[PDB]
Structures are given as C-alpha cells and as structure tokens.
Amino acid sequence: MPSEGEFHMAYQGKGWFVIGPNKNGEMTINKDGFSKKQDNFLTRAGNFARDADGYLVTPEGYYVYGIDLKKIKDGTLNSTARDEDIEKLHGNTLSPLQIPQDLTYQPVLSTKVGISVNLNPKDHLKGVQDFFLNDKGEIIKERFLNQDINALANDDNEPIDAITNRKLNVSIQKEDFVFTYGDAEKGENQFKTLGDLQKLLKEKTGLDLNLIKSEKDAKSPPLLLEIANPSQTPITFSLSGGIADKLGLNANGMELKKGISRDSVAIKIPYYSTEVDIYDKAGDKYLLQSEYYMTNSNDPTSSPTSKRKNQTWEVKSYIVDPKNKTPINDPTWEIVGFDSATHKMKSAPMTLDFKGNKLTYSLDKSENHDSSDLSYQDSKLLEASQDGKPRGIFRDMRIEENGVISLAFSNGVVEPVARIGILAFTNDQGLRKIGGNLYEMQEGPLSGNPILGWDEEGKLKFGKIRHKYLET
Template sequence: MNDTLLNAYSGIKTHQFGIDSLSNNIANINTVGYRENTPEFKSLFSAHLDTLGASNVTADDRNFGVTKGSNAISDRDGEYMPSDGEFNMAYQGSGWFIVGPNKNGSMQINKDGYKQAQENFYTREGNFLRDADGYIVNTHGYYLYGVDLHKIKNGVLTAGNPDEEAKILKSGKLSTLYLPRDVQYQPVLTTKVDMSLNLNAKNHVRPAEEYFLNKDGEIINERFLNQDANALANDDNEPLDLAMHRNLEIMMVKGDMAQDLTFKYGTGGPEKNEFHTLGDLKNLLKTKANLDLTIAKSKPDQIKSPLMLQIKNPTDPEATLFIGGPMAEKLGWTASGMILKKGETRDSVGIRIPFYSTTAEIYDKGGDKYLLKSDFFMTNSKDPMANPPTTEKWDVESSIIEMRSKLPITPQTVRQTITFDKDGKMQAKPVTLNFKGTPLTYNIAKSKDYQSSDVPYEDSKIYQISQDGKPKGLLQNMRIDDNGVIHLAFSNGAIETMGRVGIAAFTNDQGLRKVGSNLFDITNVTRNGRAAPLSGNPILGWDRDDGKLKFGKVMHKYLETSNVNAGSSLTNLILMQRGYSMNAKAFTTGDDLVKEAINLKK
C-alpha cells in the first residue's frame, strides 16, 4: 500500500485533535481560572533503511505518520481583574485552591505524602461565596478547604490564644471553612490592663483637699507631713517652683528681742536650715522660732473646703511676725509687722497639688463597660540641684467605677506609689483590683509599645492602653491577606483570625487531570509495581516555620481570568487548519497514485 495514505491519514487525525484542543481553549477564553491545553505531536514510528547501503555516513531512516504526543495544561498565570465578591480571590504563582464535595471532609498534607477522607480537587477558579449553611463554596457547590480555627460555634466567635492559633495556621491539617453571616463576638472579661502615660507636674493641679482629707473631711496627717513642699501650687494654679524660689524668711519680735531666720528649700537638713517636706518645715519652725505649721480648712464646718497652710503662735502671749521671701510671695503668705497673739495664725492662700487623672474602659463577662479610674497626686518633685538629687514620686489611687453613676464598685481604692528613675522612666509594680469577684492586673509602667515617662516637654497624656477585654460585637468586614489568612473585623473594634485558605502546589502541574467544572484531580500511574501520582504528591503552599506562602500570594477581591492567549490561539488554529488541509491534499495525491497504478494493469 502507498505509505502516503497512512502518513496523510495520521496527519489528518492528529491535526483534527489539535484543532479540537485549540477550539476548546478559545471556547473557554472567558472562563474564570481556566487552564488552556497545549497540543503536541510526535512521530508514529520509524524504520531504518538498510537497503541504502551500510557505507553511508548518515543514519538513514524512514518515518511513518504522526500521532498525538500530549495535551498538557499551561501553567502560565492568567490576567487578574478586580471583583466585588466578598469571597472572591485569585492565587498568583504556582499553586491551587483545594475544594471537595464533602462538607465534613478533611485532608492532611504531610512532608512525605497526604491523606484525605474523600476525593478532593484542585482549581484556580476563585469566585467563592457563602452557601445557605455558612460554608465557603465555589459556584458548583464544592467546599473550599483550608485551616479553620473552629472559633465560631452557634454563631458566636470566642477569642483564642494567638500563639496557639499561629501554630495551628502553620499546620497541614485542612477542613472546610465555616463563616456564617451573623457572627457575634463573644464578650471577653478584662483581666489585664497595661497603660503608658506621661506625667507633667506643671500641666494640671487639683485642690489639695482632694488628697489631704479623707471621706469624712479629716486631715490625713501623714500625707501632710510627708508632702514635698515643692509639690504644691497656689490658688492661681502656679507651681511653687521652689527650685527657683527656695527661701522663706521669718522674723519674730518678742518684746525687745528679735529673731531673724531664713529657711531654704533643699536636702541639707536642720543644720543648714533646709527643709524638703512640710514636716521638715514644721520642725524647723518649731525648733528655731517656736512657731507651728498646720494645715486647715478655710471652712471648718464643711466636709471639704479649700486648704491653707498656717503659721501659728502656739504658746507666746504675743509676737510681731514678719514673713517674706520668694516662697511666701508665691503662697500669699507675706506679713509685715503682724501682731500674732497666742493661738492666732497667718494663713496662706488655698493650696493645690499637681494632679492627673486617667480612665480606661474595661468589660465584664457579659460585655458591659466599666471604667478603671486612676488619680495621680505628686508627693515629691524632681530637684537635680539637691544633694543627692531627688526624683519625682506620685501617689496613685485606682478604682473601678460604673459608666453612668460614676460610683465605685471596688470594695476599696487601691493605692500605690510610683517613682521615676534618672532617665525619666516610671518604676511601678503591677497592682491587683477586685473586678466583680475576679482579679484584674493593672500595670501603669508600660503598655505594649510604650514606656511611661515624666518628660517635661510633653503634656500629661496617655500614650497607649492595652487590655485583654472586649465587649460584644457584630461581624462587619472580612479580609484575606496575601498569605491567605482570613481576618474578621467586628463592630467592637476587635480583629480576629478565623483561619486560612488552603493552597497546594505540585512538582508537575501537567500531571493533573481535568475532570470538568474547571476542576483538576490527581492521576495515579503504576511505576515499578507501585502507584504514584503523576503530578507528585501535594505540597503545602505555606512554610511550616513562618506560615508564609512559599510559591505565590492570595489576592482578595480579584479573579484570575482564563490563561488562553487569543492571539496565539488564533494563530495556532490557522496553522492547524493549514496542516489539516495539506495532509488532506497528500491523502488525495496518494489516492490518485494508487488509482493510476491500478490502471496500469488494465
């Protein structure tokens, strides 16, 4: 038989296969995530031409026809187009989304293989949505697989341990992803509050009676005596600033005897007539001038009224008093020849104390909001000129109060003393408050990102408050990051990780088999007596150490179009058509030759 017929026939059949493959690509040019096929041919078989002689320097052979070589899928990425779908996503790089028909299915991808409870499939079609049960599925109803942290039960999300969640997100244990629409955030009881702030003694002052008087209006003598004299302000809210206005001048005239004294703010002690606290000044006045220093309410009949400092004549029948110096001028305490009988006093203006107040929102088990309130009163000022230098010290009173009534719910106020080191950093230990029967740890020395300070060039302010409590919240938004991790944003400001989208890669993508609906499956072949995937085992898409995707990234609210190139497809289609036509012509020629040979016999 004329070999031309065999060659032409095989050419016609093979080019028909190529045309079929290319036409299918063109038909799916607008199919989301479609992977085009690339038809390839090979020679059918060949034979050596021994009749041409063994002395030839060429390998003389003869080929017979052509046949289908392969129809491999192209691993080239398609175009990426923005999409409005809430769960629409595209994967850029080497890898596939994992889907399956079973809502309760599972899959485990290990370093040396994989296990699955049912047959799963792989796709680049990322137009996912939420079904009626709240599961993430594709348009064909196949469930999207990934790592689900299973934090949502009965429509309520419960916050978990971030360290444990990060560990799970790096694993290869996959299941379906569940995210109902009406997810609520489970309220979290506040058990820890960390705060960072700056305290500036010259920013805010408060009437001294709020610190020196108890709830019954009685003077807390210990606080009065231990108060740094420089940690005070006058009724014009001006700090005394005794580092610049150190002197208090006292002259007493009793009969024909006069006593002239100058007391100075400092740390030198009684030997140098220096005082630091009001208690020190009280002792100097008593031992040096036989005078008394007291603190008293301007209106004794009221529980709380403005407090004044008093210089009192405790024992002498009568004395003439002269008071001067910068400190006296600041306090409106000056006197010039004032007759002071026994028991009479010379009063200062109302005194005030450097102060700052903070509040932090906290939440009980039911998500109800309360305030953690702290009042800061300065009891010791910074004096770098002293020997030794002194640092700031504040007395802090903390309590938990209700939002509306502002009444405390804590059994008693928690007090602590804080100091600042030479670098201006707060030194304070955490304290514990009773929050409706549960201990709450409160640290004001530092928060997550900042350290508390006393820098004078900044106002008193809160830098940051970090706490572990949350109120009730409703799901407002969902975001998928580049690594496929799903983040949920709630109306209470909480952002929680729900899980991540499953991504698998293969050593040989062309080894996957199309099964329809834009899905691919693993094809097993027998090699050396054992079945093995032609594509290789699935490879987990993310690194098991840092959890980041290794071969590409997920693009949320994008879709990958078909990777069919219209120009090259039409060009190849024309080439296939010409090949088909030429083989048909060769077949006709061979047929004519056969007919002519038959006619020779006639």
C-alpha cells in the same frame, strides 16, 4: 471576569485550590510528603459558596480546604491574640473551612489593664483638699506632713518652685534663722516636706505651722497654711524668701499671740486623671478611673542616698458605672515613682474588684508604650492595653491577596479566621484529570509531592488570590 458572591475568588500563578468530599476531613503537608484522610482534589475553579451550615463548597458539594484557625464556635467568633494567629496561619494541616453567616462577636471580660500615661508636674492642679481631706472632710495628718512643699502651687497656680528659691529667712524678737530647701538629712536647717518645715519652725521659733480650712464649717473647702503662736504670751516674727512670697506668708515684725495668726493663700497640688473603657462578661462598659496627686518632686541636688530622691505620685483608682456615674467600688490607693535618670515609671500592679471578678491593673506600661514623667510632654494617656472586648455584630469580610480571611465586626474588631488552601507541584502534568473541574495525584507521586502554597512568613510563594473575580 468580575463576580458578586461572597466566596468567589480567582488564583493567579502556579498552584491549585484544595477540596475534598468529607466535612471533618484534614490534610497535612510536609516537606517530604504528606498524610490524608479520604480523598482530596485540586481545582482552579474558585466559585465557592456556603452550604446551609456555612461551609465553603464547590457546586459539586466538595469542601474547600484551608487553615481553619478554629475561632468560630456556635455562630460566634472567639478572640485570639494576633501573634499566635500569624504563626498558626503558616501551618501545614488543611481542613474544611466553616464561616457561617450570622456571626456575632462574643464579648470578653476585662481581667487585665495596662496603661501608659505621662504625668507632667506643671499641667493640672487641684485644691489640696482633694488629697489632704478624707471622705468625711477631715484632715489626713500624715499626707500633710509628708507632702514635698515643692510639689505644690499657690492659689494663682504658680508652682512654689522651692528648687530655685531654697532660702527662707525667719526672725524673732531680735534673732535670725535661715532654713533651706533640700535633702532634710544634709546641710544645716534643710527641709523638704511640710512636716520637715513644721518641725524646723517649731524648734527654732515658738511657732506652729498648721493645716487649716479656709471656711471651717465647710466639708471640703480650700485649705490654708497657718503660722500660729500657741502660747498667750506674744511673739513678733519676720519671714521672707521665695517660698514665703509664693505662699503669701511674708511677714516683718508681726506679732502673734494665741488668737492672732498669719495665714497663707490657698494651696493646690499637681493633678491628673485617666479613664479606660472596660467590659464585664456581658460586654457592658464600665469606666476604670484613676486620679493622680503629686507628693514628691525630684530635686536635682539630691544624691542616690536621699530617701525622697524619686518623683512620686499617689494614685486613687476605682471603677464607675457610666450609667449612673457612680463607683461600684471602693478606691484602691497605689504609690507611683519615677526613675530619676530614664523617665520610666516605677510601680507595682494592683488588684481591683470588678463586680466580683479580679482585675489586675498596671499603671506603668501598656503593650507599646511606657509610663513617664517627661517634662516636655503634657500629662497624657498614651495607650490602654486590655483583654476585655464588647459585643459586636458581623460587618464585612476581607480576603487578602494571600487568601487570609478576616471578619470585621461592629465593635471595630478585625480578626482573621482562616486562609484558603493553596498547593503547587513541580509537575502539574503528572496530575490525573477527572473532568474539567478537578485533578488528582497518582502513581507510576508523579506530579511530585504537594508544595504548601505559602512560605514560613505566610506569604504565598507562587501566586495571588483575587477576591470577587472568577476564571475563564
């Protein structure tokens, strides 16, 4: 027979509901016996209801015994981890269940964030001014010097692709030179960074390789490279190769005096950005943002001795208030690397200040995925794991066929809070009847000792609980 009530249920199979007269009572069931406080009764009547304080009770006022997870404090649920829930859910100590009606979900402050992100070097680009300029629009000299020229793209978004076009032919008037992209410590006239190329170009020719603004009164304009003659006595120079073609720095017998300069097209840098919802003690949402700039590419011809073998990105992280789209924070910079074989990220967790609270932020994995620089996948946020939770209102309640009782809330959180006690016996005839409602154990323990209704997995062994049905 179906039923309407929130805690009406029916048990199929062998076994008994467990009840008792004392709220704050408990019963422990062991393989040999068992211990107790006051009396306990057994019943197959499942027409349970809540008294004024949200305790499950029979019509005679006896409390329903089960596994109280003890997550409900003060009409509010207090979150726990599903792993430890499941192991307490096969425990052996039963007590009265208390699930009040007006139940809110207390929010949790985010103190721990781990993201899994894949960073693909050929997805998104930004003008390099985003990384090479500081907040005041001034050039960060050392970022320019240490940027791998293969970790770049031109104004039409073509990767410079130093890896497959390594040769740069430069001439002065005549006189020829060959520079080659690769490990700066290997071979002859090899370069990898903009600094390495600047130094090589300065020694062999007279010319300066400079970073300049395309519009020098602009705060943050597109930036260019510039081949300049510092002396006022002129110099005629040629230049070619794939890297030159890509940058628009091709020359033949072009003359550079002090005023005259050969300038590239505007320069871009591989880019990405991620964002995680985080919550303060009140449950208000803030936005943990990260922007990624690629600084070094993994050249396949590099050996384990190469100092810049690993692909790296520099990550700028901060927290923004979504309500005024403004950081609460100064940015925290962290340098991130990738294993050249396995494509797993290599990085160290960082400490952000979240409105006076310390939040540990890890860029390199979440609960179920690791961060990577996989070429076949787009740049992508895989998973954000985090302990913070938003405010929620009670939504609905589920009671599985195993008696496990979970509560759903408005924030989309579903956590178990209890399970219905079930006990079996090898001889139910050995129990004493005290009316049609209840049975009880007795001596001569006659029905045998009570058998905990569920196995070590937490699966009921002899039956199933049916929510919103009743018996006979």
